[PDB]
Amino acid sequence: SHMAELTPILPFLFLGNEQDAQDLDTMQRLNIGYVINVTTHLPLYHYEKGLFNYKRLPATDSNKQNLRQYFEEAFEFIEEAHQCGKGLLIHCQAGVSRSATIVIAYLMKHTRMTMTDAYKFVKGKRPIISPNLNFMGQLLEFEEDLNNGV
Ligand SMILES: CC(C)(C)C(=O)CSc1ncc2c(n1)-c1ccsc1CC2
């Protein structure tokens, strides 16, 4: 069977794929209470159990998907877990391309890392990340907006 590998980017921020998000035991052992689903078609796992607060970001893994519009909605959702001492799991699909894009944006926003330093930070903890030239460009546009105060 699949062994869940919830990569801890920060002690309260976890990242994974669709298979990593279906493991209920590890999520409770890691004290997560917030889940971010960055897909349009995947179900909110363990919704019928009333254990987590869910937020879905309806995004596709295409060359036209806009992920910048969902950054601030996810940052406040991650910050609401930070302020109450609980963990957050953000996940999408196999390549973890979408969910790692927001995590890099979060490390870029609240830790003041450069896009490469933030990318090298997440790449060292989860070595398998599918490339997406669209999301790379949106992260580059996001970095210069951070360097100019927006
Ligand atoms: C969408 C996402 C960023 C998660 C991705 O597509 C991972 S793949 C990749 N491979 C080589 C580089 C980079 N990303 C990168 C990222 C930012 S600056 C840079 C320069 C080398």
From Swiss-Prot:
Active site (catalytic residues): C92
Q: In which tissues is it expressed?
A: Expressed in keratinocytes (at protein level). Detected in brain.
Q: Which domain of life is it from?
A: Eukaryota
Domain (Tyrosine-protein phosphatase) ranges: 5-148
Extract the signal peptide range. Answer: none
Cellular compartments annotated: Cytoplasm; Nucleus
Entry's family note: Belongs to the protein-tyrosine phosphatase family. Non-receptor class dual specificity subfamily.
What this chain does, per the record?
Protein phosphatase involved in the inactivation of MAP kinases. Has a specificity for the MAPK11/MAPK12/MAPK13/MAPK14 subfamily. It preferably dephosphorylates p38.
State the oligomer form and interacting partners.
Answer: Monomer. Interacts with MAPK14.
Designated name of the protein? Dual specificity protein phosphatase 10
Q: Which organism is it from?
A: Homo sapiens
What part of the entire protein does this chain span? 320 to 466 of 482
